[PDB]
C-alpha cells in the first residue's frame, strides 16, 4: 500500500534513485542502524547542540532521513545521506550552531569534493540576518538548500532560514491537498514559500527499534520530500544549477490544487498554489518563468515596493497590484547592474505590491526602454531599438495622483516602459481576452509549449486593481470592457 505522500508526488507516468547525490541533514541524531536507511547514512562527526533517551533523541532525524532516502517509504532510494547534529533531544538548537554546521559542510566539500550537494534544514527560528547570509553564500558556492517553511501558521518571511530567497522553502499540505493544521498552529505561508509538499501523516522510520515505523507531520517532512525530489533531479541532470532546479520544481508541481481559503485573505495571492511532484518521463530546451512577489509597500504617499529575481535570472517583465486599486503603477529600474521591478502607491492607497516575472534566459542583457508622458491624440509608445531584441513586457507608471505589435502602448499621461531581451531564437506573441464592464476578474492563458513573460491590463482601462501572472495565466483583477494582455514566448 504505497503511502499517500509517495503516490502524491509521483506523476501518473511511472516505471515499477539519487545515487550520485549527497544530502546533508542538519537536525537531531539519527539511528543509522535502522533497516530503512542501513547503508544510506553516514554520521559526520559534527555536533553543536545546546544543553537539554537513546530513542527520543534520534526520533526526529531518523524519520526525516527515511523520508529522503528510505528503502520502503523514501523518495530517493539510492540517495546517500549525512547527518550533522545541531538540534538537541528536545528539538532545540542555536543559530550559531547551525552556522558552524553550514560552515562544516563547505569545508567538507572543499577537502573531499564529491558530486552535487543537497542540504536539508528542517528547522526554523526567528528571522536572522546572519543565518540568511550564510545560506546565501553557501548557495553561491553552488550547494542546493532546502528548508522547512515553519509550523507557526504565520508568514514565512518572519522566519529563518525560511525567509532566505536562495533557500528553497517548503510548506506542508495534507492528503486533501490542504495546508496542514497541527492544532491551533500549522504550516507557514506567503511569498517566502516556494512550494508545498506532503507533510501530514507521513509514515517513516522510528527510532524505537530497527524495523519500527511511525507517522509524523510538519513542514520538516514536507522539506524532506523536496530534498528527495531535488536529489532525483540532480542525479538525472548533475549540470543543473540552483536557479534551474527551483524553476523545474515549480514547473512540475501540481497547480491550483490547494484550497487557498485556508490562508489569510492578504496572503493568498502571495502564496504559491503549487504541490511538489517528480517530473514525468522524457525530458531530453524550454523557457522557464516564475512570479516573484514583493512585500506590501506601506500606506504612505510614495511606494517603497520592490520585487527581485535571483542573480542568474532575467527580469522579463513587471506588474503590480493593490486591493483598493489606488496606485501609480510600476517601473523597471537598473540596480547593481541588474533590473528590479518597483511599484508606486497613490494618495489614498493602503499600499501596493510589485510583481516580477523572473526567467532563465541564459542569453542576456535585458534592458529597459522608457518614453516620457506624451500627449492625448498620440498616447505613449516605446519599442526595442537594440539589435535582435524582443519585447518581453510593458510596465507603466504615472505621476498624476488623480486617475483620468513590437511596442508598448500606454496612457497619454502615463510614462511607459519596455523590457527588451537579447533572445534572437525566442519568438513571442500577444494574446488577449476582453470582457464587458461589471466583471471582477479577467484571465488569459498561453497555450501548451509557450511561456507567459508579461501580464497587463489594456491601457485604456476603467477600474483595475492590478495584473499578475499565475504560472502561465495572466490575471487582471478589477472592481467599455476590461481586458487582460499576455505576452507569450517559446524557443
Amino acid at each position, epitope marked *: 500500500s*504505497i503511502p499517500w505522500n509517495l503516490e502524491r508526488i509521483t506523476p501518473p507516468r511511472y516505471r515499477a534513485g539519487g545515487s550520485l547525490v549527497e544530502v546533508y541533514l542538519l537536525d537531531t541524531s539519527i539511528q543509522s542502524d*535502522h533497516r530503512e536507511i*542501513e547503508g544510506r547514512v553516514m554520521v559526520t562527526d559534527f555536533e553543536n547542540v545546546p544543553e537539554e533517551q537513546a530513542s527520543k533523541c534520534d526520533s526526529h532525524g531518523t524519520h526525516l532521513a527515511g523520508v529522503v532516502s528510505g528503502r520502503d*517509504a523514501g523518495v530517493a532510494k539510492g540517495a546517500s545521506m549525512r547527518s550533522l547534529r545541531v538540534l538537541n533531544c528536545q528539538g532545540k538548537g542555536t543559530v550559531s550552531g547551525t552556522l558552524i554546521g553550514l560552515e562544516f559542510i563547505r569545508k567538507s566539500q572543499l577537502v573531499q569534493p564529491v558530486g552535487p550537494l543537497v542540504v536539508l534544514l528542517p528547522l526554523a527560528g526567528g528571522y536572522s540576518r546572519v543565518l540568511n547570509a550564510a545560506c546565501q553564500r553557501l548557495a553561491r558556492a553552488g550547494v542546493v538548500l532546502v528548508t522547512a517553511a515553519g509550523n507557526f501558521r504565520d508568514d514565512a518571511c518572519l522566519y529563518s532560514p525560511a525567509s532566505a530567497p536562495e533557500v528553497i522553502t517548503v510548506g506542508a499540505t495534507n492528503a486533501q491537498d490542504q495546508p496542514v493544521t497541527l492544532g491551533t498552529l500549522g504550516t507557514n505561508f506567503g511569498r517566502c514559500v516556494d512550494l508545498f509538499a506532503p507533510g501530514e501523516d507521513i509514515i517513516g522510520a*522510528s527510532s524505537d*527499534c530497527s524495523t*519500527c*515505523f*511511525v507517522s509524523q507531520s510538519g513542514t520538516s517532512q514536507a522539506a524532506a520530500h523536496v530534498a528527495g525530489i531535488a536529489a532525483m533531479m540532480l542525479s538525472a541532470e548533475p549540470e543543473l544549477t540552483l536557479a534551474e532546479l527551483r524553476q523545474r520544481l515549480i514547473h512540475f508541481s501540481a497547480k491550483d490544487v490547494i484550497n487557498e481559503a485556508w490562508f489569510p485573505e492578504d496572503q493568498r495571492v502571495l502564496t504559491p498554489n503549487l504541490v511538489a511532484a517528480l517530473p514525468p518521463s522524457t525530458h531530453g530546451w524550454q523557457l522557464f518563468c516564475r512570479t516573484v512577489w514583493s512585500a506590501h509597500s506601506g500606506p504612505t504617499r510614495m511606494a517603497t515596493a520592490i520585487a527581485r529575481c535571483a542573480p542568474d535570472e532575467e527580469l522579463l517583465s513587471c506588474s503590480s497590484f493593490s486591493r483598493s486599486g489606488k496606485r501609480r503603477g510600476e517601473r523597471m529600474e537598473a540596480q547593481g547592474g541588474k533590473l528590479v521591478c518597483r511599484a508606486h502607491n497613490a494618495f489614498g492607497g493602503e499600499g501596493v505590491y510589485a510583481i516580477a516575472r523572473c526567467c532563465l534566459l541564459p542569453q542576456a542583457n535585458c534592458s529597459v526602454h522608457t518614453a516620457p508622458p506624451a500627449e492625448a491624440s498620440m498616447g505613449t509608445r516605446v519599442h526595442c531599438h537594440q539589435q535582435g531584441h524582443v519585447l518581453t513586457g510593458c510596465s507603466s507608471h504615472w505621476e498624476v495622483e488623480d486617475l483620468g505589435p513590437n511596442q508598448c502602448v500606454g496612457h497619454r499621461e502615463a510614462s511607459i516602459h519596455a523590457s527588451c531581451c537579447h533572445a534572437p531564437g525566442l519568438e513571442c506573441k500577444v494574446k488577449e481576452h476582453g470582457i464587458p464592464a461589471p466583471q471582477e476578474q479577467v484571465t488569459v492563458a498561453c497555450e501548451e509549449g509557450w511561456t507567459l513573460t508579461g501580464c497587463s491590463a489594456l491601457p485604456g482601462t476603467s477600474h483595475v486593481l492590478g495584473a499578475y501572472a499565475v504560472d502561465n495565466t495572466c490575471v487582471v483583477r478589477s472592481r467599455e470592457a476590461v481586458t487582460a494582455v499576455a505576452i507569450c514566448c517559446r524557443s
Partner: antibody, heavy 118, light 107 residues
Framework: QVQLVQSGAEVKKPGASVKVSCKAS????????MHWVRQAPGQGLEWMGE????????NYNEKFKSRVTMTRDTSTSTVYMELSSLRSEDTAVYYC???????????WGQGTTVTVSS | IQMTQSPSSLSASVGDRVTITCRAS??????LAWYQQKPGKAPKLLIY???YRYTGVPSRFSGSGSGTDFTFTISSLQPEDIATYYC?????????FGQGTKLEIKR
C-alpha cells in the same frame, strides 16, 4: 512477475542434511533480507533465521544455531539453507520469504516439503 | 519475545465481527505483522506496522495496537476467510510468531 521459487521436495535419512534452494525474480534481490520459516504438520509457524543482502551476514534462532547454515549466491540471485543432524521433528514444509523494513516479508516461496525418514 | 495469541480457534457466522488478540511479553512499539494462511498455501501478509493493510487485502481486515497489546479484526466475516491467522513480532533480533488462530465459518 515478482516471485520466490524454491527447490522441490526431498527425503533424507536421520543424520543427513539438505540444501533448500530459493531463487528471487522480478525485484532487486540485493535490496532486502531473506528469511526462512518452517511449519511441521502439527505445530504452526517457526522462524529459523535470516541472511542480509549486504555482506551476506546472518542471524539464526538459538534453537538451530548449532546446525543450520544459510548462504546467498549473488550471481544467480538465490538463497540457500542447509540443516544438519536431521531428526524426526525436522519433517516439515520449509518457506523462504523476503523481508522488507516496513512491509514485513510480503513475498513468500511455495514451500519445500522435507521428510526425514529411513 | 513471547507472543501469546488468542483465541486458539474461533467459530463465527457470516457477517459477524471477529477479534483476535495478540499479547507480547514485553513492549514492542508497533513492530508487528499479521499473516493469513490458507491450508495448502504459503502465508499471505495481511497487516504490517500494526495498523496498515497491504495491497489487495480486503478492507474488511484491519489491525491495531501498540506496546504489548494488539488486535486483528474482520469487520464482517466472509467464507473466503477460512484460514489460520498468525501475528509476528519483529522488534527484537529474532522473529517470533504467535501460536495461531484457526477460523471456522459457522453455517
Amino acid at each position: 512477475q515478482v516471485q520466490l521459487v524454491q527447490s522441490g521436495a526431498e527425503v533424507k535419512k536421520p543424520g543427513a542434511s539438505v540444501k533448500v534452494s530459493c531463487k528471487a525474480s522480478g525485484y532487486t534481490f540485493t535490496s532486502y533480507y531473506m528469511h526462512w520459516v518452517r511449519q511441521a504438520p502439527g505445530q504452526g509457524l517457526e522462524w529459523m533465521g535470516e541472511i542480509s543482502p549486504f555482506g551476506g551476514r546472518t542471524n539464526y534462532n538459538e534453537k538451530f544455531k548449532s546446525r543450520v547454515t544459510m548462504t546467498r549466491d549473488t550471481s544467480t540471485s538465490t538463497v540457500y539453507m542447509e540443516l544438519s543432524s536431521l531428526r524426526s521433528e525436522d519433517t516439515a514444509v520449509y518457506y523462504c520469504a523476503r523481508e522488507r523494513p516496513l512491509y514485513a516479508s510480503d513475498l513468500w516461496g511455495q514451500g519445500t516439503t522435507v521428510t526425514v525418514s529411513s | 519475545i513471547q507472543m501469546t495469541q488468542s483465541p486458539s480457534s474461533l467459530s463465527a457466522s457470516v457477517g459477524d465481527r471477529v477479534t483476535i488478540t495478540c499479547r507480547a511479553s514485553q513492549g514492542i512499539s508497533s513492530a508487528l505483522a499479521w499473516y493469513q494462511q490458507k491450508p495448502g498455501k504459503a502465508p499471505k501478509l495481511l497487516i504490517y506496522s500494526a495498523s496498515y493493510r497491504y495491497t489487495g487485502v480486503p478492507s474488511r481486515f484491519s489491525g491495531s495496537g501498540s506496546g504489548t497489546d494488539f488486535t486483528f479484526t474482520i469487520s464482517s466475516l466472509q467464507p473466503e476467510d477460512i484460514a489460520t491467522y498468525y501475528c509476528q513480532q519483529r522488534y527484537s533480533l529474532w522473529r517470533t510468531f504467535g501460536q495461531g488462530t484457526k477460523l471456522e465459518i459457522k453455517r
